[PDB]
Amino acid sequence: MSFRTHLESVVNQVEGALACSVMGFDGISVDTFQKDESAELDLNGAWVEYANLLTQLRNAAETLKTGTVSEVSVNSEKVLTVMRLVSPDYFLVLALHADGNFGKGRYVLRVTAPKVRAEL
Amino acid sequence: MSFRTHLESVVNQVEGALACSVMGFDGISVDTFQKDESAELDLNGAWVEYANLLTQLRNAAETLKTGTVSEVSVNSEKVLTVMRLVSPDYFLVLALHADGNFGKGRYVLRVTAPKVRAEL
Ligand code: NA
Ligand code: NA
């Protein structure tokens, strides 16, 4: 709950951002901020693919617990993701539409991750 | 072996490319092309992190076997990776230095993956 201001900041800064969330390695979502605004595209196709990535996101996210791995992406045709470690139990995930700014997404999540880590 | 011309094309096109390889889900490398040329940076630190990503790359690569997942990245401070599925048994991996062109890497691997798939 202390996180949501940071999750909202990520979505606000990244063109095409669907959602920014904290997720547990136990597969239980902790907090989210979702794109509320009328997008310049129809995002329902993206929401379908994002739902269909959730199992695989948490599987790939496990690699973040290794010292060397700092960032993981699991991407579909319509949806890109960026994930970073926030604690031994939690990771941060940004989902954006494939036509969004993936470079800005990676940069903004790198800047925001320490702020989320500080709220634990 | 029919692949290597395609692996060389990827490394030649992407600034900061360390290597482009075909790897089995059995954890056995099939073919590679490595950056031979004198880089504008010292890449030994990157080679160390790339070695330390190998276990986790193959773990995250498993997600490519799902219908929805088309592309996976497992990144360190010094090394970025992009992976795509080439067959039920094999995936394609591009590793580049963190200061390389990640956007171009993703684009070139997407263009090259079908050419590698055609050589099976
Ligand atoms: Na890590
Ligand atoms: Na797939």
Numbering used by the authors:
A (entry chain A), B (entry chain A): 1 to 120
What does the paper say about this structure?
Mutual gliding motility protein C (MglC), a paralog of GTPase-activating protein Mutual gliding motility protein B (MglB), is a member of the polarity module involved in regulating motility. MglC is required for polarity reversal and interacts with MglB and RomR. Using isothermal titration calorimetry and size-exclusion chromatography, we show that MglC binds MglB in 2:4 stoichiometry with submicromolar range dissociation constant.
The closest homologue available at RCSB PDB shared ∼8% sequence identity. So, we solved the crystal structure using Selenomethionine Single-wavelength anomalous diffraction (Se-SAD) experimental phasing technique at 1.85 Å resolution. MglC crystallized in P6522 space group (a = 96.69 Å, b = 96.69 Å, c = 58.28 Å, α = 90°, β = 90°, γ = 120°) with one molecule in an asymmetric unit. The crystal structure revealed the typical RLC7 fold (α1β1β2α2β3α3). MglC monomer contains five antiparallel β-strands sandwiched between three α-helices. We also observed an electron density for a metal ion in the crystal structure having a square pyramidal geometry. We placed Na+ which is coordinated by two water molecules and main chain oxygen atoms of L64, T66, and V69. The native and Se-SAD structures superpose well with r.m.s.d. of 0.144.
